């Protein structure tokens, strides 16, 4: 049956029996009374979300033995815990309760929650909780997704998930979370803590057994150092963009101070106050694949350790302030991509690019670079480089498809420029150059898609 | 948020923290004649963010004024209202008198 | 650590207004809740209302509907209680209490108390 | 306004014994109790949370057990230091009500 969005204002009492799901969502209804719900006692999806229901009957629910999933979220059933004590009774065959965007309130969550031993994912977001005691989550053992992101919590005791040993998904982002000065759950998969206040994160030392967390989202906080990450070792993605991280534990503004990184693969340094990158730092991330570094001002980029980040398939590193780089010879075997635009590179030695093994794409824009131009190389991008003579060799012996060279007032395009590129090219764009001739023979590019000749 | 509590107590917030220095025993200092010390005192304690819905429980309307009363996007624990401090120090041969200014500090906000 | 003073209230002459006073140290003061729990010699322990010093929101018990009203003054930490034309059966030990907390946490429920006050003896003899 | 009754008035036991105070509420209380632990010149100290929920810093001795309509305080051995007056009260609806109170003295 789907009655959503009708405006009803009571429970309809023309239902069949031998319902099994029931809509609701959108209506008027404002109590949920036990005459009309206690026919359909073969209900196993109750849908009353998004109604005004403000009174819930002690004994409402207690008829619908085969319920499996209810949803009372969005409605205003935070005045029915001081309208109603008790709240919520036993469900016993519940699985999935969503309680969302009620302004529920720890204390009254403490109450409002009655006992489910079939419960399977609990959903508060968008609710008024400040803190977690320890004896708001009792008596779920076979919860394993707790959802209380955009709520106002603060502070969290030592054991407030005790009583959760099967916790793996918790969501708390955007939330107000200042300090974390210890983590123990051993079992829980994904941490998320990104949009937070957080200017210091440290986990607990020495634990019985390997934690499991998988995914930690550190993004859009305060942070001032690199978290101590020694006792995660399945730590797998991690943000740690838009911070404060100064490369490269103490909180200041509160005044509070009291191989580790083997298996994480999605590194995000991005958005913060580095300018040095120790060398020690680079040892341990072995078997990062993606690393991005942009929108730092990071000023030199070294790695002249053998083997260091061997399987490195990107580095993004745009818009830095750097005047130097160097890269060892078979140190980024692997890496085939390189974000390198938006610096200020003046000077570079000549075979800088070419002992990348297998490189494919490679933005250089906006940085004032003169032509050596890679077996390998696809994409090149040389845009607003100032340059004004490209030499004949310039891409011999490098197939690229893909060629960029715009906005380079004052260009002169020497013969034969474009040397070896007739048979790889595909297409080539030379905008706003304001190329008085071309030096270079279009039709012997069989493979050219698609030109642009504009300005 | 009254300075007493502030002062006589140990809470993770932004409040004023009490602190008395001796131009001698905490500065090291001889050349300051006059006075023996002053309340400088200092503001500390952290001003969490308060992501915000259309729909907010009555009471937890209390915490913006508590937290973010600017609605800034980054608060910080500033202080609002300063004193000045006059002392004596020899530079050279002549002894000098000042009125610095910004040195003493009673309540702190977040800003 | 947190502590709630109250002074002895000596003796009041029937008829008139008493005030007790439950000025408050070593916490922030609009921050929680103020009840007051009044001790007779004739019978148990009476609960009147509670107030919230950052609001103002005051409630009551059905007994005490306008027999008695308590304000809180801010500026020095400081709870009060005002209650006017006394009788006989009101000589009793007025104690003040927090409900442990926060104003947040407590939202409109209700919880025991951990902090008490000594109380005042406010006496009618005349 | 949920009426409570304790169930002796007063009683007198001598050291290392095992004493007993019950709690009789008028309706179901589910488990929002507590017990408190005046002495003869002092303000009232809570002793027991929720109904069995013992504090921090308070003597292991006394224990709570019950739910819903009965609740017993048990001491495990009576000391001259647990002389006094003990008190019932719950918090599940908007009237708080305290008990009546149980005197709780020594005899040789």
């Known amino acids: 049956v789907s009655c959503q969005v009708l405006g009803l204002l009571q429970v309809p009492s023309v239902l069949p029996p031998d319902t099994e799901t029931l809509d609701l969502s959108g209506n008027q209804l404002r109590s949920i009374l036990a005459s009309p719900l206690g026919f359909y006692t073969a209900l196993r999806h109750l849908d009353l979300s998004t109604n005004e229901i403000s009174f819930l009957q002690p004994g409402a629910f207690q008829a619908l033995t085969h319920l499996e999933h209810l949803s009372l979220a969005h409605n205003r059933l935070a005045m029915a815990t001081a309208l109603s004590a008790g709240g919520l009774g036993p469900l016993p065959r519940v699985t999935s309760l969503d309680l969302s965007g009620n302004s529920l309130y720890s204390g009254l969550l403490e109450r409002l929650l009655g006992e489910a031993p079939s419960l399977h994912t609990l959903s508060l977001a968008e609710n008024s909780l400040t803190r977690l005691t320890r004896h708001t989550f009792r008596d779920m053992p076979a919860l394993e997704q707790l959802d209380l992101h955009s709520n106002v919590l603060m502070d969290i005791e030592d054991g407030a998930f005790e009583g959760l040993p099967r916790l793996t998904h918790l969501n708390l982002s955007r939330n107000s979370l200042t300090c974390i000065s210890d983590f123990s759950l051993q079992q829980l998969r994904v941490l998320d803590l990104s949009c937070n206040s957080i200017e210091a994160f440290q986990t607990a030392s020495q634990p019985q057994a390997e934690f499991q967390l998988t995914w930690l989202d550190l993004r859009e906080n305060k942070l001032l150092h690199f978290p101590d990450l020694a006792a995660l070792p399945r730590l797998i993605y991690l943000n740690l963009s838009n911070n404060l991280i100064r490369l490269p534990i103490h909180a200041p503004s509160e005044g509070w101070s009291a191989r580790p990184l083997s298996q994480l693969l999605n590194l995000d340094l991005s958005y913060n106050e580095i300018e040095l990158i120790p060398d020690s730092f680079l040892e341990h991330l072995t078997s990062l694949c993606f690393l991005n570094l942009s929108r730092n001002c990071l000023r030199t980029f070294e790695a002249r350790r053998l083997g260091s980040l061997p399987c490195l398939m990107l580095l993004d590193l745009s818009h830095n302030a750097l005047e130097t780089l160097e890269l060892g010879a078979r140190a980024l075997g692997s890496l085939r991509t390189l974000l390198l635009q938006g610096n200020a590179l003046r000077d570079l030695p000549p075979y800088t690019f070419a002992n990348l093994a297998s490189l494919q794409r490679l933005n250089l824009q906006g940085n004032r670079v003169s032509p050596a131009f890679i077996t390998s190389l696809r994409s090149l991008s040389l845009v607003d480089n100032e340059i004004e003579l490209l030499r004949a060799g310039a891409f011999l012996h490098t197939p690229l498809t893909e060629l960029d060279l715009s906005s380079n007032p004052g260009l002169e395009v020497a013969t034969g420029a474009l040397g070896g590129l007739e048979a790889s090219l595909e297409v080539l764009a030379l905008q706003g150059n304001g190329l008085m001739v071309l030096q270079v023979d279009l039709p012997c590019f069989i493979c050219l898609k698609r030109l642009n000749l504009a300005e | 948020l009254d300075t007493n509590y502030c002062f006589s107590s140990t809470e993770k917030n932004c409040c004023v923290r009490q602190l008395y220095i001796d131009f001698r025993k905490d500065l090291g200092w001889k050349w300051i004649h006059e006075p023996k010390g002053y309340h400088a005192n200092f503001c500390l304690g952290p001003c969490p963010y308060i992501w915000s819905l259309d729909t907010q429980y009555s009471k937890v309307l209390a915490l913006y004024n508590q937290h973010n009363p600017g609605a800034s996007a980054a608060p910080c624990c500033v202080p609002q209202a300063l004193e000045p401090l006059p002392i004596v120090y020899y530079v050279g041969r002549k002894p000098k008198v000042e009125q610095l200014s910004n040195m003493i500090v009673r309540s702190c906000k977040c800003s | 650590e947190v502590q709630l003073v109250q002074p002895g209230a000596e003796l009041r002459n029937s008829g008139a207004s008493v005030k007790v006073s439950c000025k408050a140290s070593?916490?922030?003061?609009?921050?929680?809740?103020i009840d007051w729990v009044r001790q007779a010699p004739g019978q148990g322990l009476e609960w009147m209302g509670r107030?919230?010093?950052?609001?103002?929101?005051?409630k009551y018990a059905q007994k005490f509907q306008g027999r008695v009203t308590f304000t809180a003054d801010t500026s020095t930490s400081t709870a009060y209680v005002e209650l006017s034309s006394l009788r006989s059966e009101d000589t009793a030990v007025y104690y003040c209490?927090?409900?442990?907390?926060?104003?947040?946490?407590?939202?409109?429920?209700?919880?025991?108390?951990?902090?008490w006050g000594q109380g005042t003896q406010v006496t009618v003899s005349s | 306004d949920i009426q409570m009754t304790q169930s002796p008035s007063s009683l007198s036991a001598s050291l290392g014994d095992r004493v007993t105070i019950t709690c009789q509420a008028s309706?179901?209380?589910?488990?929002?109790l507590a017990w408190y632990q005046q002495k003869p010149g002092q303000a009232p100290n809570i002793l027991i949370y929720?109904?069995?929920r013992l504090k921090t810093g308070v003597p292991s001795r006394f224990s709570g057990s019950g739910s819903g309509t009965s609740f017993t305080l048990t001491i495990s051995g009576l000391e001259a230091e647990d002389a006094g007056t003990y008190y019932c009260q719950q918090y599940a609806s908007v009237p708080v009500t305290f008990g009546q109170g149980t005197k709780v003295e020594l005899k040789r």
């Open positions: 929720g109904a069995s």
């Open positions: 309706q179901s209380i589910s488990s929002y």
């Open positions: 107030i919230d010093p950052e609001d103002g929101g005051t």
């Open positions: 070593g916490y922030r003061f609009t921050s929680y809740y």
């Open positions: 209490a927090r409900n442990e907390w926060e104003t947040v946490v407590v939202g409109d429920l209700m919880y025991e108390y951990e902090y």
